[PDB]
């Protein structure tokens with residue numbers, strides 16, 4: 001209702017009690033974007049990005065872990081959000097290891113489809129003739145939900161593993177510890193040191209301005 005912090009500046013940031021918020025917007029001609037924080041668990045962002053190729057922004061909240069996967073007893077997160085209908089975007093968890101050589105994404109609600117097609121697509125090495133990203137694993141039930149798994153590389157060669165929920169949702173709880181354990185079991189990485197747990201929206205297009213409310217977001221690390 002009343003903000004404890006707000007910014008419309010690209011890369012404006014604020015931190016309170018272990019949580020930080022980042023107004024990340026880059027690129028040739030970024031559109032206006034304003035993030036507001038009402039408290040440690042509740043925040044919002046409005047963004048007006050043009051109907052052009054590529055991700056323009058990732059407004060997000062972040063929480064630091066800094067622990068090896070093996071030392072972790074509990075790593076879960078709860079989200080509750082209100083999203084617009086149109087545009088090109090994906091609301092996602094962004095989980096990094098401390099070295100930033102492995103990125104794990106969990107897409108909870110998005111404008112594309114779980115099979116890798118749509119106006120947004122997961123990072124992927126391979127695409128189908130229709131242009132849909134090709135999943136490496138399908139209908140995987142892990143960490144409290146069913147997902148489609150995709151594999152790709154970022155521009156600096158770092159590995160990206162993306163899980164797209166087969167059923168989109170605007171509220172839920174993810175068991176990140178178990179998801180990372182399953183990814184380790186397929187051999188993508190070893191006893192990774194978990195660095196950051198992030199949550200926000202990657203906006204490709206939101207012409208006319210679109211609003212995203214994160215009414216609750218919390219991380220439980222033990």
Ligand SMILES: OC[C@H]1O[C@@H](O)[C@H](O)[C@@H](O)[C@@H]1O
Pocket residue numbers: 055105120121122123124202
């Ligand atoms: O290929 C498009 C991709 O660009 C990356 O930077 C993003 O993190 C992915 O989530 C996105 O789908």
